[PDB]
A paper describes a structure:
The PolB16 intein carries an atypical split position close to the N-terminal end of the encoded split intein domain to give IntN and IntC fragments of 15 and 168 aa, respectively.
To this end, we genetically fused the IntN and IntC precursors, each with 10 extein residues, with a 3 amino acid linker (GSH). Ser1 and Asn183 at the splice junctions were mutated to alanine to block all splicing activity. We obtained protein crystals in this format for both the wild-type sequence and the cysteine-less double mutant (C111A, C165A) and could solve these at resolutions of 1.85 and 2.6 Å, respectively. Our PolB16 intein structures showed the motif NX histidine in possible hydrogen-bond forming distance to the Ser1, when the side chain hydroxyl of the latter is modeled back in (3.0 Å).
Residue numbers in the entry: -1, 1 to 15, 15A, 15B, 15C, 16 to 85, 95 to 107, 128 to 182
The structure:
């Protein structure tokens, strides 16, 4: 289980104790930027990074500390997951998608509605095997007990 490098996550960073910035950035960019600002560990096949003062949006529409982050090559297939949601505005239908490594069509998952800054229930609308990949895939470790974060608005472990 990892996510693709173009996965979007909501990140907050703090400097000098008192200043903070928040933005939506792709996970490969987060890794590449943060890999230079802070520095890399190495294990059997992980390059593992330990930032401080960075946070990520998780279950509960709250930011918790991002404790570590890593990237690695995997032999596993990338899978594109499309998740539909809708709201009563007269129905506005929305969908989001994330590609993961390794859940059933029809299952419900939590979804972040960015425009209304609230969490909604989504439906697994499709699942697609995109095949193997040579690119790095990425992993994030979160301090809250949900062990989950929002990945292109979809809650993933």
């Amino acid at each position: 289980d990892a996510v693709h490098g173009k996965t979007h996550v909501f990140i907050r960073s703090i400097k000098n104790g008192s200043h903070m910035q928040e933005a939506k950035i792709d996970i490969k960019s987060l890794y590449d930027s943060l890999a230079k600002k802070y520095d890399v560990q190495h294990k059997n096949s992980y390059e593992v990074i330990y930032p401080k003062g960075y946070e990520i949006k998780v279950l509960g529409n709250k930011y918790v500390k991002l404790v570590a982050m890593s990237r690695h090559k995997t032999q596993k297939h990338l899978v594109k997951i499309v998740v539909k949601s809708e709201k009563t505005i007269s129905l506005l239908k929305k969908q989001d998608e994330v590609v993961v490594t390794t859940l059933k069509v029809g299952n419900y998952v939590s979804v972040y509605d960015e425009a209304s800054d609230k969490e909604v229930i989504g439906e697994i609308a499709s699942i697609e095997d995109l095949g193997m990949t040579d690119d790095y895939v990425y992993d994030a470790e979160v301090d809250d007990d949900s062990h989950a974060f929002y990945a292109s608005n979809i809650l993933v472990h």
